[model samples]
Target: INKYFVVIIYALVFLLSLLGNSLVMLVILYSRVGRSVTDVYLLNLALADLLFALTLPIWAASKVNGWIFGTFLCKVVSLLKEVNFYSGIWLLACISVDRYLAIVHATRTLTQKRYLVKFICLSIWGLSLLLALPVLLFRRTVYSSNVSPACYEDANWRMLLRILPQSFGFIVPLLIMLFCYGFTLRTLFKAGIDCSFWNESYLTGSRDERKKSLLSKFGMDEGVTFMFIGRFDRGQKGVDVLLKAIEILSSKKEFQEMRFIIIGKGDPELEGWARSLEEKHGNVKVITEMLSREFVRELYGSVDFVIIPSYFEPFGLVALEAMCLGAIPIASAVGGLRDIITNETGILVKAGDPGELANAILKALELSRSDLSKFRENCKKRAMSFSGQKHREMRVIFAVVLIFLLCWLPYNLVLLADTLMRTRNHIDRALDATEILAILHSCLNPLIYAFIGQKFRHGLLKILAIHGLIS
Candidate 1:
């Protein structure tokens, strides 16, 4: 039973590994994987799997009978297997950490994307391969039985060196993965579950609910959704009152002549105001459906512009979304919105004045046909930057790689600088630790990226796997 179970497990792992790795490889390679961070990760992951796969037939033969391959081949195959395993594992961890970093520190990650991420990804792959050389240098295979020969290390003490690869490749990797995952979970739960519950469905937005409750009686519920950006406190009472006032204003017959759609998160009072606006005004449409990112992209593409009438917002990510898809953003000039809206792609309105918003809406709506088209095109151009909509996947991957290099360089520098103070001790330490550290570094990369990289972290959760990264 034990032997049969071993065979079954091996077969399952080998086949599943083959399928997953092959698809990832084909995606990055045949699909023009160059210049993408994710592509690079996918690329390396495929290579690792392919490298490991090369030894499966030999291992299969051993499974059926025993080692028929000579000692040299056995050692060579074992070495290659370790190389691929460590290389792939490290890369995956690095990718995940890269994603964690992106989500937790979005602005900093975006800044790194265009300039440094790609270089870092390349460095990660290169470093992994280099560190894996120690395994290739020391793997041993020997005959240990008669009928069914076993292959293993020559000297018992030399066998202890095996722990070098195990520690660097497995132990360090496990540590990094656990640490990053914990941090990411802590962050997401804090922001998403604790603070930003307004964006979530179950929050108490009485007016929006009342509208829906009333609509349900008539079977008109389409499900409400909300989106918001920046640092506006949805818990504020003043904001709710303002939203109510806006709702009242929208109900005025004059607003019907100026058609607009307003959607976002606010307190219950503000939500009530939004519902009122939609009900009272014939032309105003309020959708509370929680659209997926893809659907939101399509809607933004379809719209002329996103209207942001915020009395309190530091940075408006929503406007950024609309801008990405060629929609003009008419925002109140304050906080991050001021930096986002140049004279190029958007119009700014002064905050706290209903009159200003009304006039701006009217003027913006009356733009000449040619001018509106030109403005839309301009918005597209401006928003097509690194942090814009549609997710510049390649750019994001590149950024991940860069972050790795930035971090890795300083680490090596610190190590070397410490060593310079005592040359003899440094040389002794090198002999004692360099190879060990190399292996450690190899497996550590994946867990690091998984935690630091936002896109990667989201991806891991999406797939629910501890699989490898590519580049």
Candidate 2:
């Protein structure tokens, strides 16, 4: 029952994930724009989803019988199972962050330019490849029936290697996604804004009532501040925090040569701060207008460093944007920002301390432009780690990956104990059952993915529409 039910659920989810991802690919591939960089990433993601689908029959059989497929195919199929599973999830993470940018900030302007989206898609696949590569190295496809070889990673020292990418590729990326999403949620909730209606709402009110109408429409009303949130708040918060930090640094006379540019909205505080500084210090430069990517790049270049002092900075998308500019960053050590920036990549500070913020500003001033080159290069290099193939070792424990025996051992210990109590002769059977359950976990990706995917219910409908051979 366990094997059959597990296999049935696995196959169902596998097919569904495949169909939905394929539909997404088809839409992107055949669209009027046709195969931009995002399409390339989607194509790669679909490839992974398809491979996951291919694993269904093998898994179904594993549940029914003991070594039905020849040993070799078992190893090959098992390895592919994990490889594709993670590739799909990592792809989803990229898509989520991409949507966040397209919907929220569009601050880079180039980000809305599509080419940048293409570039982002390219980088995602590139990083997915690097993250997934290590697993292939350990995936030697060893086959044997001596162990509980009915579709399970060997968990040996070499096979144990798959855990690295297992964590970084799937686990770590998920962590980053949650962190980014959390901030995105908070920013939306607190920004006293609303952007969900951006693509909609045209002429809902008369010309004389236009300002009130527009404000009400985009959730720009202070009266409705407690009413609803715009989805773009998190991205805006990151931008806001960076702008606030810039205004703070503008106070120093010694930092006069450094420039500060604030792009998003200049709420009264930012506007007031900017005006006061511009009038008082004569060195403050603040542009409340939307910035073009070229302009953003130029402005970022003109400045010595990027500063983000968010109280609970999640990933600090702005800081990542800065890193892409090869600008040194001083960021709050929170969420994805912490993950993205290392000692080698950029400087980090406590999330909400003006003192630490001030110290970071001073530190930036201390580094001569020439002295800052290495940090820039380091940031670029760190960015590359998130670039190519997000994969490295630990991807295929079933492919003779023996190192996971410690994990499998304890699991088997309980199974073995139960088997001895029930019947000494059934020891191997009990051990196999427990270990397989533990090991089968690697193949359970689709269920985990679709449940949190939000649109998965609609995705299921789409998948059902294509279910010709599904039964």
lDDT of 1 by residue, 297-412 (tens): 54455445566767665445566666655667877786556766788778888777656765665566555234466676676555444242223333444443344344343444
Worst 10 residues of 1 by lDDT: 191-200
- Candidate 2: clashing residue pairs, number: 42
Which residues of candidate 2, in runs, are more than 4 Å off?
Answer: 14-20, 33-46, 96-148, 155-160, 191-471
List lDDT for all candidates, in order. 0.52, 0.50
Q: Provide the lDDT at 111 for model 2.
A: 34
Q: RMSD in angstroms, all models?
A: 15.6, 15.1
Best by TM-score: 1
Q: TM-score of each candidate?
A: 0.39, 0.39
Instruction: Name the candidate that leads on lDDT.
Output: 1
Decoy 2 TM-score against native: 0.39
